[PDB]
């Protein structure tokens, strides 16, 4: 669980 990971489809 990385809160800085891309949270979008693209």
């Amino acid at each position, epitope marked *: *669980a990385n*809160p*800085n*990971a*891309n*949270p*979008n*489809a*693209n």
Partner: antibody
Amino acid sequence: QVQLVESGGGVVPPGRSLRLSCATSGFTFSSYGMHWVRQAPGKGLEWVAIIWYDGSNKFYAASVKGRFTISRDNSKNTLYLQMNSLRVEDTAVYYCARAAYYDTSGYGDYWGQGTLVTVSS
Amino acid sequence: SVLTQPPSVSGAPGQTVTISCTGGSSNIGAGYDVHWYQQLPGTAPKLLIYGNINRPSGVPDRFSGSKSGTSASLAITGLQAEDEADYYCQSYDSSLSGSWVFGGGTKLTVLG
């Protein structure tokens, strides 16, 4: 055409509950992560929470974890913030923001107009 | 604030002002991108600079961002009354549990 329209703010005593809503149009809601950010009157911005586009992940500021739940309804193009056990120090304008991402960190490319939560006894 | 900004800056119309944003080795020093927001009094923040240096197409050419080491900076050339606002830098800090960290904000006064 990108609209983020918030509602649900008002005046509540400490320990009460409020649900904020962020009703979106003008983009494919289900493709985007969304954030809540807050600002105490006269103070700076504080990130509150994020939800993934697909709802796979939710993260919270330490200041609200255990008390607030972020959620979304893709069929209503709507983001929610469930705020339980409100404290006077939760008094703020709450903003929703559409998630964007650059290379090594994220940012908010569109922001709601804000809704004021006043927690007072 | 993980990110340190001057509480206040000012300038006269036509002048250049610079707003600094100082972090550390787990945020800006770690290479996590910096972004900037403009908040006109009584309005929601608006994106001003993203990915350290990029203007959204709607932002005038007077706004620019730079980043070196543990510091970022926003420069505003050709200062206008409309620029009077609070400015926030924003990044991510690997030593904290949130998606975004903010600077404490800088109040820009345009001495008009």
